Structure formats: C-alpha cells, structure tokens
Curated annotation (Swiss-Prot), chain A:
Phosphothreonine: residues carrying this PTM: T257
Alphabetical UniProt keywords: Cytoplasm, mRNA processing, mRNA splicing, Nucleus, Phosphoprotein
Protein name as catalogued: A1 cistron-splicing factor AAR2
Source organism: Saccharomyces cerevisiae (strain ATCC 204508 / S288c) (Baker's yeast)
GO biological process: spliceosomal snRNP assembly; spliceosomal tri-snRNP complex assembly
Highest classification ranks of the organism: Eukaryota, Fungi, Dikarya, Ascomycota, Saccharomycotina
From Swiss-Prot, chain B:
Entry domain remark: The MPN (JAB/Mov34) domain has structural similarity with deubiquitinating enzymes, but lacks the residues that would bind the catalytic metal ion. Contains a region with structural similarity to reverse transcriptase, presenting the classical thumb, fingers and palm architecture, but lacks enzyme activity, since the essential metal-binding residues are not conserved.
Domain of life: Eukaryota
Subcellular location per the Swiss-Prot or TrEMBL entry: Nucleus
Miscellaneous information on this protein: Present with 468 molecules/cell in log phase SD medium.
Effect on the protein upon substituting R105K: Severely impaired growth. Reduced growth at 30 degrees Celsius. Strongly reduced growth at 16 degrees Celsius
Stretch list, region RNase H homology domain: 7-237
Impact after mutating D22N: Reduced growth at 30 degrees Celsius. Strongly reduced growth at 16 degrees Celsius
Organism of origin: Saccharomyces cerevisiae (strain ATCC 204508 / S288c)
Protein name: Pre-mRNA-splicing factor 8
Encoding gene per record: PRP8
Amino acid sequence: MNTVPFTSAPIEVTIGIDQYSFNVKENQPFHGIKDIPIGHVHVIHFQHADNSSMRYGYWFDCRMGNFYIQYDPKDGLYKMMEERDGAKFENIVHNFKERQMMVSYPKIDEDDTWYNLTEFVQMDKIRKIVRKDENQFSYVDSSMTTVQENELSDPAHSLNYTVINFKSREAIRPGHEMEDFLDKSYYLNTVMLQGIFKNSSNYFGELQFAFLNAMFFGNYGSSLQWHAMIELICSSATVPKHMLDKLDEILYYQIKTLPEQYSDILLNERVWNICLYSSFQKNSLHNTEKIMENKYPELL
Amino acid sequence: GAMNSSNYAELFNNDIKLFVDDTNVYRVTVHKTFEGNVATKAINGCIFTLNPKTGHLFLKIIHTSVWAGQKRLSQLAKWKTAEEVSALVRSLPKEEQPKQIIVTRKAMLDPLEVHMLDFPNIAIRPTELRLPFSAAMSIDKLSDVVMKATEPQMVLFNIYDDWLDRISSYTAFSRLTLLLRALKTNEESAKMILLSDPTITIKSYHLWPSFTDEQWITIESQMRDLILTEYGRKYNV
C-alpha cells in the first residue's frame, strides 16, 4: 500500500482521490492519503472552497516513485512533486502515519469500481497525451484544450488525444466515400486499431482516460473525445466480438459511476441514441443499454 | 452558412457558384404486381447543376442502369449525386471551379462534403430558399434528352437562352424561378400560357419561346396570376 503525504493544507479545499472525496478546512492538520492500492493509476484532484472553478489534479502511479503534495502560495495551487530521497520520504510518511494525520484510501473489498474504470489506462500512455516529460505524474484541469480543439492555443498545455474526424481524408478512402462514411470499420480497424493504437487495449485506455478527465475535471474536450471513440465503434459494422463485449463492460461502469445530477452536461443525446438504437451495434451493448434506460430514460 | 432572402444578391456576384438539385436523380413509377403487391420501376433521372450568374446548366443524365442490383436507392441517389458533382468540379479547369456549391436539400450536405474532401476551399452550403428546380423535367427539351438517354451522359445548356443580352442575372434568375414555380403548381396551365400564340417559337438552340421584352411582361404577369389562384384553391382563402 502506497502513501502520498501532504506538507500541509493552508487553504480550504475538496480533495478527491479517484472516485472518493474529502473536505479539508483552512490550516486543518491534514498530511495526506495512505493505503493507496498498488497496481492501478490514480488521480488526486482539487477544488478550492473559494473558487469552485478550476478543478485540477494529478495522474500518478506509486510504482514510478515517491510523490507528495505541497501548496504553492505563489501559483495558488496544491502541486504534486517527487521526493528522490527514499529515506527522507519513508521517514516523513512514518511520522505522519504514527500521528494519524492521514486519511485512508477507503476501498470496499467487493468493490472493483476503480479497476473497472482504469482497466486499460497505463501511466506511460497518459504521459504521451499530457506532455511534461520532466515529471512522472501528469497535471490535468477543467480548461485544458485538446490538440483537435486548437486546430479549429498553447501546444505545451494541451491534451494530445488521438484526432478522430468522420469527415477527413484519414477517415474516408477515395472511391469508398459512401461505404466508409456509413460503415466506419476501415477507419476503426485499419487506420486507428492497426495503424495508430496498435491494439484494442491502447484504444480502450485512451477512451477510459478521456471519460475520467470529463467526469473529474468537467474537461469538455475530454468529453468530446470519449463520445467520438464510442461513436467510431458503434458506427462500424465489423468489430471483433471481444471488443464489443469489453466495450459494454467499460461503458456500464462509466454510466454507473457518473454523478446522477451531471447526465445533462456529460452525456451527448445524439451519440447515445445512435449507439443504443440506430447503429450496427444497437443489439451489442446489453449491460450499457439496461443501465442507461433505468438511470437516464429522459436523455433517450 | 445557409443561403436565404437576406443574402440573395450573393448569387449574382463574380464568385463562381453552382446550385445542385437532386430531386430528379432517382425517379420511379409505382405499380401493382400480378400477385397484387406493389413494385417500383425506375426511369431515367438527372442532376440539375446550375450557375445562377451565367445560366450554364450541367445536366448529368442518370440512366436506370446505375440502380441495377443496388439497395437503399433513395440513399444511394444522394451519394451518386455527390460523386457526379465532384467528378464535374475535377473535370473543370481550376479557374472555372466553383468557390461555393449550394444544395437545394440539406440531405445532400454530408454526401457532397465527403466527396469534396479534396477541395477544402470550396464551401458547401444549404439554403432556406424553396427553389422550384424539381420542375426542370417540365421543360420539354430537358425531359426529352433525359428520357431518350441509353447510357450515362452530360448535356450542357444555358437555361436563360439569350436573356442576359437584354437583362441582368438577378432578373434572369427571377424569371426562371417564376416560370419553374408556375410549372410546379399547374404544369398544364403554365405550358398553355407559354405556347398559346403559335407565332412565338422556341429557337432550335433555346429552351423557352423567343418573347419580345413586352411579351415577357405579359407572360410574367400570367404566371403570377396562375400561382396566386392555385394558392387560393389549395388553402380555401
């Protein structure tokens, strides 16, 4: 079990760790989060009590180093940092644990929610979508724009999601216009899976990471990417049987985890109605269709 | 974005543009089968591609053979239209290629956009105008060349005859739409109005009769009267 210590909590803030959240009061004696499950990526995220604008946070994997949070009163945020001194860090964490100044990652044993949301998400793939190669962890916030948003303004602070565009030379073979537009199987299987992603796992990894950025930060560009990657599969007549079965499980846990009160801004009516009722895969997402009908029958 | 009565004069500026109407591409007669079911028989169609400034009409004849063994023909018809327009642009020298193409039906937007991906500088636009280009097959000479075609064929016309010698393209387009609106509302009445005086003929190289300027005013008056009557009848007002 890994630990992310905090130097202090000088400003009142809601702290998230993955799907969990805790309110911390200004100067409350809070010194971090222990018992973090090894083997998954994690996100630690922040919303200041005084500005419910700029949700921000850090993707990390505790296997890749010793990370801590320290408030920066110049830049006015909680910053993730790496401690390279193994002994200093073990000693910092042991003191804070002994003084019980740390909250415990509150995983229920039966509960596979976090695994299910991050099954294909790899820290090495996050660092290629979020480029800041001097850190082993990745900063994301509410307002960061995607490379595809910038094409239609700072390249260094962008989300480098794979560009998907159904009306692009990339998506449409010359002489196969109608065929490729109405059945995107060639765009999905040759261009995206064989060409760019190399395998379904990397494709699902980006899809899951896009969803989580949409949910945790209300990152609009991420929400657009999540929907585009769903639509590309649902709009392909030819999809490997295992990809469809896995997609149904992925989306089921995403829909299950969404805050009930956020369905209006994070779910795209057209895409979901298409996927579930119109598309080639209308009959292929049983679990996702059942949770969407019972939990958001309005949207449809 | 969309073309309407607020940006009407844009049609007659010096930026090359074409209207595309697909309403006569896929044409059927519905009939009973021996077993008492219903079936369609396709007849020859046409794409109506018109430069509203010059009157140049690119009439692509759609021969019934293009439908043989195809499914979902009303959907294919939009894509075949987009394919042939795209082939037409590529066939024109660069300085003749349109800067915009306006589709009379919004269902053509995605088909044409996808077929024109090689031409990012050509704007594909819808219109809020209710244009009567569906009545093109009420012009006897256009109907004749479509129905006689034995293979796919492109035929070039000037839908304004020699009118631009005497009137502007705004006025020529207004006369064309009035004529086509009348032919669409009551073909029989419109056609009677146009040929009632057998001393006025259609030149071999023209589509419409050789009316003097005063005769065109009388004709235009009779077309408006026809359109109004039919409207009163339609709506009992």
